Design a binder for this molecule. Structure first.
Ligand SMILES: *[C@@H]1O[C@H](CO)[C@@H](O[C@@H]2O[C@H](CO)[C@@H](O)[C@H](O)[C@H]2NC(C)=O)[C@H](O)[C@H]1NC(C)=O
Ligand SMILES: *[C@@H]1O[C@H](CO)[C@@H](O)[C@H](O)[C@H]1NC(C)=O
Ligand SMILES: *[C@@H]1O[C@H](CO)[C@@H](O)[C@H](O)[C@H]1NC(C)=O
Ligand SMILES: *[C@H]1[C@H](N)[C@H](CO)[C@H](O)[C@H](O)[C@H]1O
Length: 495
């Protein structure tokens, strides 16, 4: 283990400074002995996933807050956690010296880091690209004879994905999403702005676009990468908006329904990539449950849809009415958060050491977990201090900020807030009930690991310390305190 090297940039908390020869890391995982619990703590004051251990007490008295585990109240199984290998992320990582690149990838993907097991891969260019390109820019190439991967794939994204998978002990799942089709498949003949596919589902435009998904999967498979899932389109509602400034492809829910049923479903099912799962929506949860009803009430579409992908950008938060109602209507269709991102209109894109932006991530993950969501995918894995590069200056924050001039990278509070979940909630973990004895300002969630062991995350977004006890009837009582502006993860064996 190496501790955080803290640095202040004058905001509420510190970043952890890494370079070619030093980065903060964990010792190999270890389980706490029966009758004991592990505690990982991060605080605004500067603690970064610090490990301590306490006893599980046989009984408890007091009127203080009690959180009772309900281990027989069983909910969703977790797919996992990760982020996006954009052109911007890969260009930033590969601008560091080889040893600093390795410590950055280890921070995310190693058991000595925070154990990411998902990577979202854009299909060609998005706003976090330094140019607009698709895989098939030769006009009217319906047979896709000029389909090919540019250097952004073969020199930046694919080599970093291979290195990520080599560092991971957990199996990593790849998720692919397109922003735009070739312009010659679109009504507006442009990568951006208001525009859909030409014609109608079933026709040559729609069959070509479905075949483009298979050519992408074919080209990645030639580079020995296989996908867990693809989304039907990144943010289909964006391409319905006049002057939408970057790469988009408009679909109404009806258009998405018919494209999946007539073209994408059958084309993927008849390919060598038929095991790849399809997620629908990949957009703001405010479009639910309407979008799920339109697509999934058509059995010709539903038979091809594994899941619903949601974005957090416009959450701010009717989770019950959107995520909850959707689960109720379609309980066997998983909900997956495919894009989360932070910033206030009066704040810069990157705020080095923002505890507030950390708290937004952990709060979002807890709310999602409490409303059936199985997985949570950050946006850019890494950005520069301006929040780029980005061909349209749509600059945002990232858990890791690379300073190429200093051969340095900064781990933001967001990285640690994500880590409190990603490191301690492996694939197959199941959310279980956790009931509070009184109204409280805390956010908490409980899950059980595949092996039966318990995990609880407790976030305190208030300034006040909150004494609390966790009751697990199988083992006893965890007496602890949630300090103001802290996040804790608690682990214990149940037998
Ligand atoms: C990379 O970061 C490490 C850790 O902050 C730097 O090593 C420290 O350097 C300072 C100043 O020379 C020493 O006082 C510390 O004792 C060092 N710590 C360790 C663990 O070695 C290192 O200098 C940085 N590298 C560069 C190129 O700036
Ligand atoms: C399209 O493909 C043909 C045949 O392989 C090739 O000769 C030509 O250079 C390609 N066009 C572009 C723009 O790459
Ligand atoms: C499905 O795949 C088979 C075998 O590759 C092929 O012969 C057939 O034409 C395909 N069907 C359609 C409708 O594309
Ligand atoms: C989701 C989100 N708006 C981020 C913001 O950084 C980015 O624009 C993605 O392209 C969007 O899909």
């Amino acid at each position: 283990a190496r501790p955080c090297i803290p640095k202040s940039f004058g905001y509420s908390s510190v970043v952890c400074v890494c370079n070619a020869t030093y980065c903060d890391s964990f010792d190999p995982p270890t389980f706490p002995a029966l009758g004991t619990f592990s505690r990982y703590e991060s605080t605004r004051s500067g603690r970064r996933m610090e490990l301590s251990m306490g006893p599980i007490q046989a009984n408890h008295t007091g009127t203080g807050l009690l959180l009772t585990l309900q281990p027989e109240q069983k909910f969703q199984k977790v797919k996992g956690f990760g982020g996006a290998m954009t052109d911007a992320a890969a260009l930033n990582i590969l601008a560091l010296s080889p040893p600093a690149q390795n410590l950055l990838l280890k921070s995310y993907f190693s058991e000595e880091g925070i154990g990411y097991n998902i990577i979202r891969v854009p299909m060609a260019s998005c706003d976090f690209s330094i140019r607009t390109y698709t895989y098939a820019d030769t006009p009217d190439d319906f047979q896709l004879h000029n389909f090919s991967l540019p250097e952004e794939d073969t020199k930046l994204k694919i080599p970093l994905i291979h290195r990520a998978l080599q560092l991971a002990q957990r199996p990593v799942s790849l998720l692919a999403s397109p922003w735009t089709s070739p312009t010659w498949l679109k009504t507006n003949g442009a990568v951006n702005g208001k525009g859909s596919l030409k014609g109608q589902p079933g026709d040559i435009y729609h069959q070509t676009w479905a075949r483009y998904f298979v050519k992408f999967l074919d080209a990645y498979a030639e580079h020995k990468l296989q996908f867990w899932a693809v989304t039907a389109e990144n943010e289909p509602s964006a391409g319905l908006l006049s002057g939408y400034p970057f790469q988009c492809l408009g679909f109404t829910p009806e258009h998405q329904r018919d494209f999946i049923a007539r073209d994408l479903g059958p084309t993927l099912a008849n390919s060598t990539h038929h095991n790849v799962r399809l997620l629908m929506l990949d957009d703001q949860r405010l479009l639910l449950p309407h979008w799920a009803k339109v697509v999934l009430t058509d059995p010709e579409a539903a038979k091809y849809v594994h899941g619903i992908a949601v974005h957090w950008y416009l959450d701010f938060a009717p989770a019950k009415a959107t995520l909850g109602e959707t689960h109720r209507l379609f309980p066997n269709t998983m909900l997956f958060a495919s894009e989360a991102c932070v910033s206030k209109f009066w704040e810069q894109s990157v705020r080095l050491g923002s505890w507030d932006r950390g708290m937004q991530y952990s709060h979002s993950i807890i709310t999602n977990l409490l409303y059936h969501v199985v997985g949570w995918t950050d946006w850019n894995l890494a950005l520069n201090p301006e929040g780029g590069p980005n061909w349209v200056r749509n600059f945002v924050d990232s858990p890791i900020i690379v300073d190429i001039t200093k051969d340095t990278f900064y781990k933001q509070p967001m990285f640690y807030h994500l880590g409190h979940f990603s490191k301690f909630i492996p694939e197959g973990s199941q959310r279980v009930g956790l009931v509070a004895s009184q109204k409280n300002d805390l956010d908490a969630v409980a899950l059980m690991h595949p092996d039966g062991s318990a995990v609880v995350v407790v976030l305190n977004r208030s300034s006040k310390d909150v004494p609390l006890t966790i009751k697990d009837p199988a083992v006893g009582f965890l007496e602890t305190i949630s300090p103001g502006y802290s996040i804790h993860t608690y682990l214990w064996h149940r037998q």
